[PDB]
Write a protein that binds this ligand. Structure first.
Ligand code: NAP
Ligand code: W8X
Length: 316
């Protein structure tokens, strides 16, 4: 049962959530049920994961058995960048909310800052695999998303994969109604995000750490790629506390007041991953872990490098 990070809306965002990317149909429902049982309240979802309907089924069950009040649940989903044109924001969201069988989302995030070709082809690409841009921007999207908050369909808005330059563009937009309550970005010992975290915090924006375990099952994973869970320098620290590497990797974010959403459909791991409130990494250990930084991203979306608002070119 987790602590919280307070958002600028005074809302309380549970500091550990369950990730659902690539959680297969036929296992994600069980994963959500096991998670809620184990004390998880934060569930990270997305339209593009195309499993929200099963997530929704699992949440409905736990609600009616009263394992949890809806108000105790913190549900996040995200707008995919092929839906930045205004009517598409509404339709994408409605499909998300319908699949989820909920009456409101706690947070709705812009999934990526760069607009893709609009429509229902989620991965518009040229023969070489490069992403196809669209003309609607994350500003056009945000505008429409703000209406969701007005109508109470969404409690708060956020962004994901944004650089500080992007955040600035958002905050300095004349006629902005709502500010982002979080920036969800890849974060872990190899990509510690010190400057971006500093920047978001100085603006009232929390950070949500995705792929905290290095996303070891991602599709594009090459054996030469570094591997956090197998890192002897991470494993040493874990051994020092008789905890697993995953638990250290998750705890690291908690002690930075950074929200963290490890993905699993394995019951034992789902439990393990929230058992991170009965130990504490020393300052020496936190400093050692931070020193592992090498600015390596497991998620680069390099196929969209050529589009205007590519977030990862900037330093932070
Ligand atoms: N905003 C974005 O652009 C974006 C991008 C990526 C991810 N995300 C979100 O962040 C979540 C987490 O990131 P991620 O899914 O990329 O990867 P991750 O959480 O770093 O790692 C997930 C992988 O680690 C395994 N795992 C989980 N717990 C473990 C443990 N205790 N011991 C050993 N292995 C363990 C899982 O296997 P099993 O599942 O088979 O147990 C899964 O293969 C996603 O599910 C998604 O909700 C967002
Ligand atoms: O958002 C995430 O959790 C991880 O990102 C993805 C998730 C899914 Cl289910 C599918 C694709 C991605 C992703 O970002 N893929 C790389 C990509 C994206 C767009 C194009 Br066009 C080409 C490759």
């Amino acid at each position: 049962m987790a602590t919280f990070v307070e958002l600028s809306t005074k809302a309380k965002m549970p500091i550990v959530g369950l990730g659902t990317w690539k959680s297969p149909l036929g296992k994600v429902k069980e994963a959500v049920k096991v998670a809620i049982d184990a004390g998880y309240r934060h569930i990270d979802c997305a339209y593009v994961y195309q499993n929200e309907h099963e997530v929704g089924e699992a949440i409905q069950e736990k609600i009616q058995e009263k394992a949890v009040k809806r108000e105790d649940l913190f549900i996040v989903s995200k707008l995919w960048p092929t839906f930045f044109e205004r009517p598409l924001v509404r339709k994408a969201f409605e499909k998300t909310l319908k699949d989820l069988k909920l009456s409101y989302l706690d947070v709705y995030l812009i999934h990526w800052p760069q607009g893709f070709k609009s429509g229902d082809d989620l991965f518009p690409r040229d023969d070489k695999g490069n992403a196809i841009g669209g003309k609607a921007t994350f500003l056009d999207a945000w505008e429409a998303m703000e209406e969701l908050v007005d109508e109470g369909l969404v409690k708060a808005l956020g962004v994901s994969n944004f650089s500080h330059f992007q955040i600035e563009k958002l905050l300095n937009k004349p006629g902005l109604k709502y500010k982002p309550v979080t920036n969800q970005v890849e974060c872990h010992p190899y990509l510690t995000q010190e400057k971006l975290i500093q920047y978001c915090h100085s603006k009232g924006i929390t950070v949500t750490a995705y792929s905290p375990l290095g996303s070891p099952d991602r599709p594009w994973a090459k054996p030469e790629d570094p591997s956090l869970l197998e890192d002897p320098k991470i494993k040493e620290i874990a051994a020092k506390h008789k905890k697993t590497a995953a638990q250290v990797l998750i705890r690291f974010h908690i002690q930075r007041n950074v929200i963290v959403i490890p993905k699993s459909v394995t019951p034992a791991r789902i439990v393990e991953n929230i058992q991170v409130f009965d130990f504490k990494l020393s300052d020496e250990e936190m400093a050692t872990i931070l020193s592992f930084n090498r600015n390596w991203r497991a998620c680069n979306l390099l196929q969209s490098s050529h589009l205007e608002d590519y977030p990862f070119n900037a330093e932070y």
